[PDB]
Design a protein around this ligand. Sequence first.
Ligand SMILES: *Cc1c(COP(=O)(O)O)cnc(C)c1O
Ligand SMILES: *Cc1c(COP(=O)(O)O)cnc(C)c1O
Ligand SMILES: *Cc1c(COP(=O)(O)O)cnc(C)c1O
Ligand SMILES: *Cc1c(COP(=O)(O)O)cnc(C)c1O
Lengths: 393, 393, 393, 393
Amino acid sequence: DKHLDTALVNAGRRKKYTQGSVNSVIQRASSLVFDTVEAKKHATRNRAKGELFYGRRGTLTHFSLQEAMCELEGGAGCALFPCGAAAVANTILAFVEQGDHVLMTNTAYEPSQDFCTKILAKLGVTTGWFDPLIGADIANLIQPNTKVVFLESPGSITMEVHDVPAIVAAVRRVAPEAIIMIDNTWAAGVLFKALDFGIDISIQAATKYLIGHSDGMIGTAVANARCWEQLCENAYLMGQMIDADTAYMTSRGLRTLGVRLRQHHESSLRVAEWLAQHPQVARVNHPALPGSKGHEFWKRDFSGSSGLFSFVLNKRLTDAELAAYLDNFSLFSMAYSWGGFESLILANQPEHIAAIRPEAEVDFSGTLIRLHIGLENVDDLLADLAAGFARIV
Amino acid sequence: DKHLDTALVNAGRRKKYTQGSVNSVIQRASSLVFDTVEAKKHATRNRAKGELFYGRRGTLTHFSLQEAMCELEGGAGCALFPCGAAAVANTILAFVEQGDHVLMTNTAYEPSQDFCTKILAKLGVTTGWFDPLIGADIANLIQPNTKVVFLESPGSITMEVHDVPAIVAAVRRVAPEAIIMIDNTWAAGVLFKALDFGIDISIQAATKYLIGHSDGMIGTAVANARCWEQLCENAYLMGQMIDADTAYMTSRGLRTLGVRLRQHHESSLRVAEWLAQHPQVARVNHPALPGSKGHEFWKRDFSGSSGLFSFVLNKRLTDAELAAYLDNFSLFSMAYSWGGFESLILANQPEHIAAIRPEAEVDFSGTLIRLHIGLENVDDLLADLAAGFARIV
Amino acid sequence: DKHLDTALVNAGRRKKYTQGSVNSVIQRASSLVFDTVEAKKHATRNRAKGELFYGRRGTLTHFSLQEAMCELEGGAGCALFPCGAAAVANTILAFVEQGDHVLMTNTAYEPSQDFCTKILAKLGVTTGWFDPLIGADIANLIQPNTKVVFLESPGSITMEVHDVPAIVAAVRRVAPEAIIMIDNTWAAGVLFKALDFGIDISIQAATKYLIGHSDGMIGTAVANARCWEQLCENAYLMGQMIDADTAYMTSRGLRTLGVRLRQHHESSLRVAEWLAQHPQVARVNHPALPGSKGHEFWKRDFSGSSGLFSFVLNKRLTDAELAAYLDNFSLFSMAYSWGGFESLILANQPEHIAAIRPEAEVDFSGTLIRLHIGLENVDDLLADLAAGFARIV
Amino acid sequence: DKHLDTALVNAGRRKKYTQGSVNSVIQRASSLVFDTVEAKKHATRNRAKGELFYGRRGTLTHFSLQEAMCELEGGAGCALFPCGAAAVANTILAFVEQGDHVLMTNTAYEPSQDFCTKILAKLGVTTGWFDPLIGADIANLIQPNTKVVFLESPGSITMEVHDVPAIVAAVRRVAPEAIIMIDNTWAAGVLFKALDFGIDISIQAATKYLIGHSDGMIGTAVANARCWEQLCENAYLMGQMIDADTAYMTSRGLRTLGVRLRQHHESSLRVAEWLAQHPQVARVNHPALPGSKGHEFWKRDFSGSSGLFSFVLNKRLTDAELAAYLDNFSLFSMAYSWGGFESLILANQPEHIAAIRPEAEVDFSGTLIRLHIGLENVDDLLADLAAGFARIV
Ligand SMILES: *Cc1c(COP(=O)(O)O)cnc(C)c1O
Ligand SMILES: *Cc1c(COP(=O)(O)O)cnc(C)c1O
Ligand SMILES: *Cc1c(COP(=O)(O)O)cnc(C)c1O
Ligand SMILES: *Cc1c(COP(=O)(O)O)cnc(C)c1O
């Protein structure tokens, strides 16, 4: 959108929430006071509709964020969660019952898989898997009991991009009433407009790019009108909420999301292009890089890139080589999470990736390195990476 | 304990968390940085044991609170949640599988009931009910599939106190492996030492007295050694956590919990004694008041009282009488939640209470008024209540 | 007042600030938005009168605290500062110019003295000193150019209590238009109602008991109608303000100030009475203890005590004894500040105190110990002190 | 510098402050605990050198920000203040005494001027004024008692850029030991490396671009080695500090300062170039625009631009036209401050500016419009300005 940046600056900022400041007020509250019985009745009737009722439903600060998220992702409502993993687990749980079946991409975030295999399984809900590029063939995996189809594009760690139009079309042909979900964290909800593709719910670890500074955790799930009420009421029955201050900080992160993502795109594509020419690199998994799995879909369906990608080295590094490589970076830091201002580096052994690719086998044998490209000078990052290569040459 | 106040002041405050200040540092984080591969391996091995690993597991701020809660309630570990309702729902969920049965007091908090009837039911887990005074007779309700027995003493709104020794003994005679849980919010975890009575897990809406100021929401669940790992790992698979700042504010609330509770006890018992003599009052439900349901158990099993209690008026007030009464209080405010510094008032119609007392019928027909007695001058509160009575005489 | 606890719970909490919650909202702002030119003009006219104008003047959060402090201390306005030392320095500075003279108690807080001797002096403002028990004889020290009379009752460290009625009556006889100020931190502004005694400005380190938890730092100055505009505008010209969050935490602290102070009073008076009987104690300096300097004025003029006081040992400790004593306490900690939930201990040799008693000597030769008595169980604190005495006997 | 973005991401982030997280911990404290007498002595000796001593000196959070600011601005120390106006007032005050003279640019921020004329003057410190383009001719205004030369480049509102090399060389010829200060807020301390030009102290309203989101208020002053101790100790005697949380939020703001400033530069230069072509615009005052006063010094001496500038309309608006223009913008808002993510607009008549140009007249007669260009899509901002022009044509 030629207006995305204006939208990011303004989303959620209504006078009833800001009360004269630029940002929403921070309203910290469990108790919300009813001046009269009539006010209490009105609040009770509208307790899920943005009238102050009880802190577990939200205060003005949450309502402001919810409105911002619905504007930006084009949904009827936005559920809030203590983190991304809580958003995934509780959004799925909100729509499954015993005897149901979940069809999930085998490139899904590992905690999302483990929720399915270790929590859903014991509650009489089964989970099947599909390859991220299955396209229309996903119709062959839809079972009569399949209630949820769970997408994640690009995939975790390995970055494969779905053909969402093909998947959604097939799904709607066989099971039109299915709930289609996507973990849209990589796109920060704004580089891939999931609800415009017929997906029902767009889930985010707002922890990542929305917070944008590695110092807050929160999950969001923006649902279309069809699914909102079931998502909202079942998530609430599980007590799912976020504190008002983190909600404020997520709204605040939105304001710089455009300038941040443009830099992450520029810098990470430059690094990926360099890696793709490098003699010590076997493969580069960057959706914006020509040749990456699902790249043509990224070009067609996304409006940009973020800064997280991965590449495969020429060999499965030993523990000793991993230390010489990873321990001595000057700018990249080893840590989980991503989407912040700093660059991060992590290693995944191929066998370990195989272990979180259910009913599939990986097609590489070198150590996989996942990079988050932050806001540092890109030439300094390249020098850091080159020093890393020299330590394992 | 003659040392409870010293314990409250000091619990959780170790140098590794406070780093020279009186209170723990606030460490806001998703990304936790591993300086070396060996540090990452050590953190991974100990990722549930208080080594910094990932923000979803906690930072130093969470670890400090967890240690404080385990010291005060005598547990092996403490799981953290976005609110009390999340603690209840996810602690139960952590121990049930399809085909299991939950036995819950029919005086349980309404959201706890609704979690059971609207979430568990659809996942192949059934829920039966028991009267809060069932004592040893609870053995007759234990089914072969009963995995969880859920206590709440005193009960929500109506304040009936369990005979926990009798309940636990019966349960251990019939189903020793059962998971016995209690919602110990009213006692703030410290006026009733649940794990000392053979209960497995003590759950709190820390939102209430631990936060103590009506401006933060958080749930806790402190488990014995038998149950800790299952609670911890399954809650984590559901993404359950609290933000670091609210964890800091819960630790901070602990420091004044003793002085606060002593005032709430004194003031509320005085109000209850006055109400018990009042011609417009049919019943007073205060566990510390002679004559209240389960009072003798409160005297035997609790080390004090908090400030929440209820009473029954002589009549079922109409909507109009409810407004004349509730709208014109000067000091009491109408709001949900409790456990703060201010006094609160809410009305519950008898028919409404009947509706949240499954497989039971209430034994009163007047409107029930629930009072939270805060830190105001008690004589001013009495004058406010007297003015209320005059408006409906 | 028989309503002070009700006032503490309710002060500053108007709907325009709370907007539905129990506590005021936290409005973080520099920019405050004017919808129209007319709105901008109105805000400009009322920029010192609680209309949103610019964050340096305050937001809703500051206005709420300002109203609370004016209600509790009975003033026309309350200026806010980054800490207590800033409140003292800038409140004095607001009322002086080259050629003026300040008359200050020689028991004033050491940073207050240093502000006078190291900042004011080179700006052409002289400072004279008086003994805290001077009473009516202060009239003899008033010079033609005396502009400010600065009180601190009880005094720092040595705890001498002024005869404020005698001092004020004498000042008003000679210099009726003098600006009489007090550092009222020990009373937390509520145990001694300074403005009711004819003092013009009551200054506090809200850092201490108002915050109550040893984390936030903030200064306040509550002025009568005669002095408010000059205080407000001149402090504003020095850019003095506090952040919105600390202002929120100060308002929040007020709510438990009554229950906290009653415990600090009860426990510190007990400790003082015990020390007074102890053979290793030469003197106890506690305003509430009979025999302490100015005790009779404390009993007449205050409505209670806080928890800070000092005592003099029966000997001068050697450096080895100071370490053996101080290094090995179990519950008392060595730190500056006070007014929190935990107990603190510091030591000073007589000549250290003499060096901060301008134009005076000290009347003791033993080591002085300053104690802050927190919220721990008092018998535990007594055992800690007894163990310390045994280490130096 | 080709490393400025890497420096912004990493400045101040040492392990002793971050303790495992990406950002520094937030250590809220007044009291800082000494485990032993020897530890207390060590902290005392190093109380201005980054050892924990007392919260008025700072905690780990402040130390981290101080180190970041010294690295980025190339100074020996950084003093912290509650807002920019406090930093200006207290940094000047730290270096003057009765009989001294201050020489200030007549384009200085109005509160800075008012501090000089309304506070300093009655303390025996005189202030003289100079035109911002005076250059080497400032030598003729240096008096025997001139102690401080105060620069502000670009100037407030009218944006004139000094020739700092010429000014500094002239001052050093006549008064080599003068204290040369600059309010470097517009450059955010990084677009103009003041200390590299021989300026002694670089002051900022960190409120503006460092915070970057219009919420926090904070002042900073970075001094060279010659001036640091006097600045530090005299600001400390006035109690000047910032709260730990705002210090954290300032460090956090640094991380996105590069990506934000590049957008503000690009967008504001585009708007300025467009306004310069517009028939309703008489003049554009933007340091980066050719023809603007001192533009050539901006191009030589700065490494970029921020987003604040002004322009002069082709006529003097009537009051009716001012309302029609200002009241009806869709994206630009009327508010004070700047440096955030959103665009702002204010107006001043020529005589308003003349009244804050001491000893000078203004050289324009049209209404002056000050714009802050935020992060919105620039074509949307242009359309908003075009619609405004149509309302007054
Ligand atoms: C990081 C991650 C999550 C987890 O969110 P948390 O806030 O860390 O619980 C979920 N989905 C994806 C794609 C992620 O990368
Ligand atoms: C208030 C309440 C809860 C709910 O906790 P929230 O933090 O409000 O979700 C749970 N149990 C009891 C007994 C309660 O009163
Ligand atoms: C604490 C103290 C101060 C200074 O307050 P800070 O907030 O630490 O700057 C002022 N007066 C008294 C009496 C104090 O004890
Ligand atoms: C904003 C402003 C200041 C004052 O800063 P505050 O934080 O608002 O007190 C100082 N100098 C300049 C140039 C300013 O624009």
